[PDB]
Amino acid sequence: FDTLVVRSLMTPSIATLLGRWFWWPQRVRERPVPSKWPT
Amino acid sequence: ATQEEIIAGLAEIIEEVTGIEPSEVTPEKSFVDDLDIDSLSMVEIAVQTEDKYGVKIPDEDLAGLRTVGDVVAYIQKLEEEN
Amino acid sequence: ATQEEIIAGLAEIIEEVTGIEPSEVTPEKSFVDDLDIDSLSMVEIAVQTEDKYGVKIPDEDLAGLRTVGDVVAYIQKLEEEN
C-alpha cells in the first residue's frame, strides 16, 4: 500500500502543493531562473 | 524566442517524456498520431516547459493542440505577443 | 558617482548579507528574481549603505525596486537628489 499509493501518489502530491514551503526552513525556489531557449 | 530555438527545447523535452529522438521530431509530426502521445503525456511536456521556459498549457489547450507545428506556433504566438 | 562605483559598493554588501559572488552582481540582475533575495535581506543592504555612504533607502522604495539597475538608478537619483 505504501509503495504503490503513499510513496507513488500521496507523497509526490503533497510536495507539489506546498511548493517552496515543503522544504522549509531551507529557502528554495518553485522554479529556477527563467532560462532562455537554446540555439 | 526564434522558431528554431523553440523546436530545439521542445524536442529535447519530448525525449525525456517519451524517448523520441530530438532530430526525429519535426513540425509535421503530431503528438497524438505521429508521436503517439496521449493527453497525460502531453501534460508532462507542458509541465517541463512551465518549469524550464515558463510556458504552461492546461488540459483544454493541450487537447486542442495536435501537431508540433501547432505547439511551436502556439508558443511562438506567446513570443509574438510580447 | 559612476555606475560601476555604485555597483561595486552594492556588490560588496551582497557578498556579506547573502554571500553571492560579485561576478553574479550585474545591473540587469533582479534581487527578488535573479538574486533570490527576500525583502528582509534587501533592507539590510540599505542599512549598511546608509551607515557607509549616507544613502537612505526607505522601505517603500525597497518594495518598488526590482532589479540592480533599478536600485542603481535610485542611488543615482539620490546622487542627483543631494
Query: CA distances (Å), C7 to each of C19, C36, C39, C46, in order?
Result: 16, 18, 19, 13
Chain A partners within 8 Å of C34 (Cβ): 33
B30: left (phi over 0), alpha (psi -120 to 50) or beta: beta
Chain A residues closer than 8 Å to C33 by CB = 33
The phi, psi pair for C10, rounded to 5°, reads: -65, -35
> Which chains have at least 3 CB atom pairs separated by less than 8 Å from chain A?
B, C
Q: Is C10 exposed, middle or buried (0-12, 13-18, 19+ CB in 10 A)?
A: buried
- If one counts the domains in chain B, the total is 1
CB A26 within 8 A of CB C36: no
Residue among B31, B34, B36 at smallest CA distance from B61: B31
What single letter denotes the amino acid at residue B35? L
Spell out the residues 6+ positions from residue A9 whose beta carbon is closer than 8 angstroms to its own. Answer: none
The verdict on B71 touching A (C-beta cutoff 8 Å) is: no
Closest of B58, B76, B72 to residue B29, by C-alpha:
B72
How large is the angle between the packed helices C68-80 and C3-17, nearest 10 degrees? 120
Q: Which residue, chain included where needed, has cell 537554446?
A: A38
Spot the catalytic one: C36, C38, C51, C61: C38
Q: Which C residues in the span 6-65 are in contact with A, Cβ-Cβ below 8 Å?
A: 33-34, 36, 38
How many CB atoms neighbour CB C76 within 10 A?
15
Domain of C73, in residue numbers: 1-82
Q: Which chains touch C (3 or more CB pairs under 8 A)?
A: A
- Measured between alpha carbons, how far is C32 from C62 in angstroms, rounded to an integer? 11
DSSP C71: H
From chain A, the residues in CB contact with C38 under 8 A are: 27
Record: contact A27-C36, CB cut-off 8 A: yes
C-alpha span between A14 and A17 (Å, rounded) = 5
Resolution of this entry, Å: 3.3
Between the CA of residue C33 and those of A31, B13, B44, C36, what are the distances in Å? 10, 24, 25, 5
Chain center to CA of C13: 8
- 8 A C-beta contact, residue B37 and residue B17: yes
In sequence order, the β-bridge partners of residue C30 are: C67
Q: CA nearest B25: which of B14, B38, B36?
A: B14
